[PDB]
């Protein structure tokens, strides 16, 4: 059989060993070329319990993205150790899909329960060497470029009744989020989003959040207060730190004239926070040219509140592991020998 176990996972990459893109740079030095022929062994009449909040792989993937970021991005004013003014060149930044894989003596067990919440038992199951590709995008509030749920919008948590544990919302349709910054002031950008797309789905989400809260009134509001990075929508595009006001996205009035394309007042910061550890940093004034990411929204991180006839949900974000958890939910390491 196979006992739940851990092991160091090796990364299948497609990263061509010629690009100065700092993901390619790292993923060539640390990672092998991809599998040409991924095999999947569907294990019949075998049930296995998974847990996305207690899956080891999350921490390994997390180790890498830090390592990757720490060798590739260096702050001109790194406010951690005293007076660090170390070099900050302008290098290529575009996420690439990593495959984490187990050597012989270990398998990756993949769950095929199509509407699987991430924790608890999985009846329909398989075996793999490797995961699907995963882009290590660093973001809060919205999960960009991830996966879609197979059928239904699946709501993920360790404890639904515990308002402390963050809820991962997994979409089934994707929403494009055009995030542009005009060339030639510097510190001001805009994320163009289709309104008629977003609220048709934010509703589909509400009906799902009803299903797990006894048909109570589902209500969104801007983050109750907290660091600029998790109150605003903080992510990275072409080596720049976007900070977008996502208030106009989480609208209740819509879910009625709402069709119109919504746009977020973004503004790129230099004096920023750190998601790796506690402390501040500083990077150079943003690069020139029409900066844009054609990002595809596939998830929402959410925090609840304390209970009468309504339930409040504000945008979550901070535990960047959760991002990897949203992608690694159906996989688990197992020893054979």
């Amino acid at each position: 059989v196979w006992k739940d176990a851990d092991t160091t996972l090796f990364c299948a990459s497609d990263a061509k060993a010629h690009e100065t893109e700092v993901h390619n740079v790292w993923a060539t030095h640390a990672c092998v070329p991809t599998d040409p022929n991924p095999q999947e062994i569907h294990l019949e009449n075998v049930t296995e319990n998974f847990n996305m909040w207690k899956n080891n792989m999350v921490e390994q993937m997390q180790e890498d993205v830090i390592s990757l970021w720490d060798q590739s991005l260096q702050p001109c004013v790194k406010l951690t150790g005293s007076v660090i003014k170390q070099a900050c060149p302008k290098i290529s930044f575009d996420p690439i899909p990593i495959h984490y894989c187990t050597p012989a003596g270990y398998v990756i067990l993949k769950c095929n329960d199509k509407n699987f919440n991430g924790t608890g038992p999985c009846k329909n199951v398989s075996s793999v060497q490797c995961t699907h590709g995963i882009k290590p995008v660093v973001s809060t509030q919205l999960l960009l470029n991830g996966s879609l749920a197979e059928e239904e919008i699946i709501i993920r948590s360790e404890n639904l009744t515990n308002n402390a544990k963050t809820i991962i919302v997994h979409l089934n349709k994707s929403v494009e989020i055009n995030c542009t910054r005009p060339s030639n002031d510097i510190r001001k950008a805009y994320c163009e989003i289709n309104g008629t797309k977003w609220n048709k789905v934010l509703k589909q989400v509400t009906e799902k959040l009803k299903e797990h809260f006894n048909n109570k009134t589902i209500i969104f509001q801007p983050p109750s207060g907290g660091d600029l990075e998790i109150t605003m929508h903080s992510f990275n595009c072409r080596g720049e730190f976007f900070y977008c006001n996502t208030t106009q996205l989480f609208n209740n009035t819509c879910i009625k004239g709402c069709n119109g394309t919504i746009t977020l007042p973004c503004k790129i910061k230099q004096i920023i926070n750190m998601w790796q550890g506690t402390g501040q940093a500083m990077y150079a004034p943003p690069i020139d040219g029409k900066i844009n990411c054609v990002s595809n929204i596939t998830g929402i991180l959410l925090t609840r509140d304390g209970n009468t006839s309504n339930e409040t949900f504000r945008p979550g974000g901070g535990n960047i592991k959760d991002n990897w958890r949203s992608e690694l939910y159906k996989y688990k390491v197992v020893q054979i020998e």
Partner: antibody
Amino acid sequence: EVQLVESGPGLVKPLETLSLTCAVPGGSIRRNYWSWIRQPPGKGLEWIGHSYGSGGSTNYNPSLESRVTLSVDTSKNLFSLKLTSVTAADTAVYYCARTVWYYTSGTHYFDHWGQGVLVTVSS
Amino acid sequence: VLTQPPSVSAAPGQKVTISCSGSSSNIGRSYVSWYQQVPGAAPKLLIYDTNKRPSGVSDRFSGSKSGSSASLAITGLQTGDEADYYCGAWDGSLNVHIFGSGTKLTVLG
């Protein structure tokens, strides 16, 4: 751009033990598989075995199974081999290589080779 | 040990093919790799997974396999190509990487 460095006695007596060093600067040692391959001067290539970075799962060349040890000092970034009761035959050029090894597709290939070390077996 | 002809030779700018005769339990199993060794340095990977080139390796080099036999097709021959060539399949009979015997590409000259 992925580096390997071999090291060894160069001259070794017969019926001794051949001790070969392969240094992998830049971490990544615990991550991948790594092989030891020899080549007699002016002759064919011979894969000896491999060892996973962590593992320590190892797979040996059955005709050399009895005499080959592969170990991975992860703290010092090293992957070395011991070869016991060496003969005149084991005189060859030795190099380590990084290994891609997906079990159940085939895909046993060496994508990153070190430069090489020559070992002479003469009493 | 896999079988391949010792000498291949042709004028510059021409196409050559390098055999690699195996069996059901190596090339009938595994993906094939090829190793270019110029004299007298260590080998480098030329082809893998039957037919894939690691960045900065001409499509002039081209991999293939047929049942229990592989080939390395080379076009646009230059002097730089003059080297030794070894195919590399995994083998579940004896659980080994079985190397091709060896072929010497000679550009004339």
